[PDB]
Design a protein around this ligand. Structure first.
Ligand SMILES: CCCCCCCCOCCOCCOCCOCCO
Length: 389
């Protein structure tokens, strides 16, 4: 729900699509019902995801500065056992990769008046999901599936919060803690620099969906992703306002929610070479209407500083389309397009069968340019899969 390129080489290479198509073990993260579309035997998957973001804000620019905001390379492994009407599997998929690392010599450093620096502007969100799923042919044409995952969410930024003063415009009611004394006092005027470093949390998520063989050549499906339940993000941070003001203590974040998700899609085989998929996805960010407050405790002491962040978003809809072309017995080509709004990326991938039971797959998603703030984005994925039977 944070990026949205789909999981695995097949899905990424086919527009993030996957509701009614067999996209491999990654199905555990999309539509669990899709497993069991796979062939009997045991399947092992091994690969890694890479997010390459480049951002230019004017002239500041995190993206790929030098060598420390480089790309996160998250590993992914998966197991799937197929037998008769059954499918069982577990995996470790590392979604999330929206990190930034601007310098220290630019603005966003320059504060609401003219002062500078600090440890400066960065930000990183990492999310691990360990799904345990099952898929069952309830019929020769109906297959349901589901998966419950353990989730590891880990973020941490480095940013300034001026908003002048006021603390919520003024007497709003949000900001205000029994340590908000240094605030107002001190004697700087502009430069709240928090430095999470580091605030994870173990949560629980899950999903279930179905596929229905309308015809031997057309399949449909739908999947529903429950609202993730991440719990509190705890971590030792070091706040510091602005001369300059240093501080230290561990912070707690409550209500960092991940929206529920609904997905319906279609797949059709036009012959033994070409197949096409199309999915519709809705991300209910409208249901994340709660308060997200950032707490600040410090030593053995009870110095406080709460800040509530209003959360009012709107549902996001994304449409996807992809094709899988079986060029021949060992080369498969995939391409697709992914559109999100209410935001656009070309998709491609190639699979090479190193003989049956063994296949290397490489997929990549390229975002189109949006614009100030302009960013480029590339999502590469490479996986190795071997089945035993
Ligand atoms: C609709 C898409 C939203 C996706 C973005 C979710 C990421 C939001 O921010 C998470 C970090 O929390 C921000 C906190 O405020 C800044 C620091 O805290 C203040 C000091 O007490």
């Amino acid at each position: 729900v944070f990026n949205l390129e789909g999981f695995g080489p097949v899905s990424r290479a086919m527009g993030g699509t996957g509701a009614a198509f067999d996209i491999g073990p990654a199905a555990m993260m999309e539509n669990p019902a899709t497993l069991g579309l796979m062939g009997e035997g045991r399947h092992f998957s091994l690969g890694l995801d890479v997010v390459s973001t480049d951002i230019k804000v004017t002239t500041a620019s995190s993206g790929n500065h030098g060598n420390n905001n480089g790309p996160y390379f998250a590993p992914q492994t998966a197991f799937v056992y197929r037998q008769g009407r059954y499918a069982f599997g577990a995996g470790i998929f590392a979604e999330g990769g929206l990190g930034t690392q601007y310098g220290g010599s630019s603005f966003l450093s320059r504060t609401s008046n003219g002062v500078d620096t600090g440890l400066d502007q960065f930000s990183r969100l990492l999310v691990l999901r360990v799904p345990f799923s099952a898929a069952y042919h309830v019929t020769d044409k109906l297959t349901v599936g589901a998966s419950v995952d353990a989730v590891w969410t880990s973020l941490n930024l480095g940013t300034l919060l001026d908003v002048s003063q006021i603390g919520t415009l003024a007497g709003q009611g949000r900001v205000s803690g029994t340590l908000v004394p240094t605030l107002l006092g001190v004697p700087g005027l502009s430069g709240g620099y928090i430095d999470f470093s580091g605030v994870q949390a173990w949560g629980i998520g899950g999903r279930l969906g179905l596929t229905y063989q309308v015809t031997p050549d057309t399949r449909i499906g739908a999947a529903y992703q429950a609202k993730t339940h991440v719990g509190d993000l705890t971590g030792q941070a070091t706040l510091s306002a602005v001369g300059n003001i240093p501080l230290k203590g561990d912070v707690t974040v409550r209500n960092f929610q991940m929206p529920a998700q609904l997905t319906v899609g279609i797949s059709h085989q036009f012959n033994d070479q070409l197949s096409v998929s199309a999915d519709y996805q809705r991300v209910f960010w409208s249901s994340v209407m709660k308060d997200m407050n950032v707490g600040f405790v410090q030593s053995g002491s009870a110095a406080n500083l709460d800040l509530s962040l209003p959360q009012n978003y709107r549902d996001i809809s994304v449409f996807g389309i992809g094709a899988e072309y079986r060029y021949n017995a060992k080369w498969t080509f995939r391409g697709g397009f992914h559109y999100a709004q209410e935001t656009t990326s070309l998709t491609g991938g190639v699979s090479y069968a190193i003989g049956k039971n063994d296949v290397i797959d490489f997929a990549l998603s390229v975002a189109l340019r949006k614009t100030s703030v302009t960013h480029s984005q590339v999502n590469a994925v490479i996986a190795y899969q071997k089945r035993f039977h």
